[PDB]
Design a protein around this ligand. Structure first.
Ligand SMILES: Cc1ncc(COP(=O)(O)O)c(CN[C@@H](C)C(=O)O)c1O
Ligand SMILES: Cc1ncc(COP(=O)(O)O)c(CN[C@@H](C)C(=O)O)c1O
Lengths: 396, 396
């Protein structure tokens, strides 16, 4: 049965990580991966997380199954984070949240739920997007189409091209929005622009699907949710895939959420029952430990305050690196203006380097970025900045 | 989009659990759920698990993503548990294991992998089976067919009916075998009978899929794997979905494995690459904590010994309950011979009670079993045994 199975192609992200480990050069620099790194180059466990895990170790008396939608508090705290305390959506009970194995699991649960219980055939994502979106939706049998997004001259949101593009989307198509900190570009809509997309989408009949991978990494927890909130104010129906991977540093524990919103509480409950069947036929029920850490942090005043500062420190260190990057490039002699990096948000920026330029940075300089030019800004530190920028300057 | 979505039907397992909690009677007895309970009625965290979690709390310095197939040691220990130390399969490197979110996740990963990379159209499961099998395979677009299994007169494996049934299976159909401790019947093939099924399956061209939910609950870790091993000796190709939920008491942490076996190491690696794409398009990578507990227990002499005794204690307590059940029924006046319970294995037994009898046991007596007559033997204790059996006796 297996004699003739075609190999899965390469995978440059792992390919890059492999090439990076085997690189026996002292001053190699990884900007190619998807996780936060602190000033030291490490992806540490947050102090708040460690305290939560201790508490769970001392107080857990069973590992009995969670319900299909996971820990009730987790869902409640997730809904407040996304929609704000006081949200009519929450008051009217129009939102149901399932705990999922990460943001990816959330996208997959949404994808299966739609493919099986609606007429949805098609999902629109930005060009470029993170490449897993396409594979998740394709697996549930959903076509994926691209909308224009990035302006390559100006390193900016090509808004006219985006709108023009999406006029091709029919009533009943899904349109996926990165809630903040666009992956791979770092370029987000302004509030004025979100508001405009919200109007267009109700007029055209799109089901909005928000992907929140980095809430708290642009300007703050609440600010970063504004776009989603402008849509929430306008729409009867939407879906949110969220991840706690980056903002709690809980990558490997698979801590995410799929949140379903419908016109009313009777409707969301009915729809959600089928979202639960879709979880049931997949991984049955979600993994406790990570989500439990999150719920125990969010629902405790002291731990939440510690965690909010930790999140603020990550956001600011990225912001200082964006600025040190541009300032160091100007003074190592760079033949372009990079101040567009400052206006970009979160862990990622399109550097504007060519695929040949990134290839060269790897081979000559041991500086590793993704083929598209995506850099992880958190991969920069005050110590590796000088040589990072020298190398780039040399390739321009 | 969601206005007209049909509700997911009820769900008696949750329906039963709900009805059981709201039951305000002092002496209610739950035999209806899928988890182990100790003499006290609790589903506790194993001591070995608690020690492993402490160690992880003190030594983990990152939660960075695991690879798509999870923790390498986990896979290695999984393969030894299934195939035995010394297994040629392992020596020849014909087996690849992915860590998965539970046994269910393992079945789903297998289901997607097959639906997408082979001509498999159809999976054969026992009548009866656990009802999640059907939903998992149906979700990946696989037809499910039933093979005969249970002999209702004799409370026995109707082996002639099973073979006769499976002659309808074409070359290239999957046939799912419960490795031990059949759910819901407790009835397993003898070694002689496994050996015979192994021969038939190579002759008919079936892809065997083993589901191991309760390894160590029939007679012992190694004994319980004999059936799988007789198949392994005979086949170039098979798949194993395993779970550590019951044997480590790690239900909510979603600790399982999908193990792929092919004729050779070149082939399994190629096939496994596509199994990994199927994980990638689903939950991306698996949850660390639970599997990490398992690997840290299995690869440490002291902790493994503690855990093996704990597993032996669970198996024996079930065996003592099977015997106390039959002995108490004889002496509370039961109008049938129940000694078939003693020959049944693991947490489950088909009691042979009718759906009307189970309904009555609930309404009159607050004794809760599943509609089919499935009882969880671990739900019995020396304290609830007298009244359990009185109630049954009264309904016969
Ligand atoms: C937009 C977006 N969606 C989903 C995810 C996945 O989150 P989970 O770990 O919760 O499933 C990421 C992570 N981006 C990193 C990891 C990348 O660059 O690959 C992301 O950037
Ligand atoms: C045969 C079988 N397969 C898979 C599973 C699921 O294991 P995971 O929790 O690892 O996904 C179970 C558990 N049986 C119990 C829980 C039941 O009666 O519902 C099972 O009995």
């Amino acid at each position: 049965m297996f004699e003739n199975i075609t190999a899965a192609p390469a995978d440059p992200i792992l390919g890059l990580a492999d090439l990076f480990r085997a690189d026996e050069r002292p001053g190699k620099i990884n900007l190619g991966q998807g996780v936060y790194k602190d000033e030291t180059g490490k992806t540490p466990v947050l102090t708040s997380v460690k305290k939560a895990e201790q508490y769970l170790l001392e107080n857990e008396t069973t590992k009995n199954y969670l319900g299909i939608d996971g820990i009730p508090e987790f869902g409640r705290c997730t809904q407040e984070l996304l929609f704000g305390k006081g949200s009519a959506l929450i008051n009217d009970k129009r939102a149901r949240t399932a705990q999922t194995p990460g943001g990816t699991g959330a996208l997959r649960v949404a994808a299966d739920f739609l493919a099986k219980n609606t007429s949805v055939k098609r999902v629109w994502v930005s060009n470029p997007s993170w490449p897993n979106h396409k594979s998740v939706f394709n697996s549930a049998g959903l076509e994926v189409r691209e909308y224009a997004y990035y302006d390559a001259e100006n390193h900016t949101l090509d808004f006219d091209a985006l709108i023009n593009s999406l006029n091709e989307a029919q009533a009943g198509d899904v349109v996926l929005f990165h809630g903040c900190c666009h992956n791979p570009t770092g370029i987000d809509p302004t509030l004025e622009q979100w508001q405009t997309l919200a109007q267009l989408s109700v007029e055209k009949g799109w089901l909005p699907l928000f992907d929140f991978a980095q809430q708290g990494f642009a300007r703050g927890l609440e600010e970063d949710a504004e776009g989603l909130r402008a849509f929430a104010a306008m729409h009867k129906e939407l879906i949110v895939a969220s991840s706690y991977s980056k903002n709690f540093g809980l990558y490997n524990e698979r801590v995410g959420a799929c949140t379903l919103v419908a016109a009313d509480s009777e409707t969301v409950d009915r729809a959600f029952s089928q979202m639960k069947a879709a979880i049931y036929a997949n991984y049955s029920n979600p993994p406790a430990h990570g989500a439990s850490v999150v719920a125990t942090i969010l629902s405790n005043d002291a731990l939440r305050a510690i965690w909010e500062q930790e999140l603020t420190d990550m956001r600011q260190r990225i912001q200082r690196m964006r600025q040190l990057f541009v300032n160091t490039l100007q003074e190592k002699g760079a033949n372009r203006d990079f101040s567009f990096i400052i206006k970009q948000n979160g862990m990622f920026s399109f550097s504007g380097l060519t695929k040949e330029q990134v290839l060269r940075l790897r081979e000559e300089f041991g500086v590793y970025a993704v083929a598209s030019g995506r850099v992880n800004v958190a991969g920069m530190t005050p110590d590796n900045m000088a040589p990072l920028c020298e190398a780039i300057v040399a390739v321009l």
